[PDB]
Amino acid sequence: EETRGVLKVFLENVIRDAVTYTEHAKRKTVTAMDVVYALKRQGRTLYGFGG
DNA sequence: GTCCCCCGCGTTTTAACCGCCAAGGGGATTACTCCCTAGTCTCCAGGCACGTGTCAGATATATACATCGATTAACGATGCTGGGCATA
DSSP: OHHHHHHHHHHHHHHHHHHHHHHHTTOSSOOHHHHHHHHHHHTOOOTTSOO
């Protein structure tokens, strides 16, 4: 139960940013890159995606 | 040394996944023009360093006033003690 709790905490912040990059460009479709940078900002960047 | 909260396991219940097809929002491309920027000149007044200046606090400092602490000179009353005078 706690563990999901934290998942929730991690999940928001990312989307927070995601949303921001989607919106600084005036775009309706949220890019996956958009997620990457987000992860990059917290230092959890994902290889495999979106060079 | 004790107790009860997880794992293993069989069966019961829900919804993830795959396949298929639809439809339109939104992202991607393109063309044109026009505002906004880098680049370039002149100028200084903004900014940097520093001498000069009277005002916050802080520190005594000469001068004066009020209050004792303690000491010393002066005054009231002797106490035996010493130096002599009338009686056994």
